[PDB]
Design a protein around this ligand. Structure first.
Ligand code: NA
Ligand code: NA
Length: 137
């Protein structure tokens, strides 16, 4: 229940909703609302993660150099994963526009499948980051 974990949980819950591609999700995917709201949740997660690492550094027991660089890489992966999710949802909005009003059912099937894989990567990187934070502490 760290602050950054709760922020990530809000990003994660929002994204689990987007994954359903329900009527209201689809509406908000063609405006900028889903990507704006996800970006705000991503920014909060990253801000809290940075502050948490900064506070952990106050209670630390060449090895330090390596672990700090490894932790930085794991944080950067989490942020890139969230950016990749947002970018795929921006791509969807453009794909829909290019259809000129034709059915988007196939685009939605493909988006759902790809989102599942992006979410798997985000979750595995979150778990790796949490493990490194626990061992850093
Ligand atoms: Na959830
Ligand atoms: Na389609």
């Amino acid at each position: 229940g760290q602050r950054w974990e709760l922020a990530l949980g809000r990003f994660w819950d929002y994204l689990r909703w987007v994954q359903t591609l329900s009527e209201q999700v689809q509406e908000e995917l063609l405006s900028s609302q889903v990507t704006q709201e996800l970006r705000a949740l991503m920014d909060e997660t990253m801000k809290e993660l940075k502050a948490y690492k900064s506070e952990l550094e106050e209670q630390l027991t060449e090895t330090r150099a390596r672990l700090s660089k490894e932790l930085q890489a794991a944080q950067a992966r989490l942020g890139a994963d969230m950016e990749d999710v947002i970018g795929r949802l921006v791509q969807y909005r453009g794909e829909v526009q290019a259809m000129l009003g034709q059915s988007t059912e196939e685009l939605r099937v493909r988006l759902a499948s790809h989102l599942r894989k992006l979410r798997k990567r985000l979750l595995r990187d979150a778990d790796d980051l949490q493990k490194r934070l626990a061992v850093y502490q």
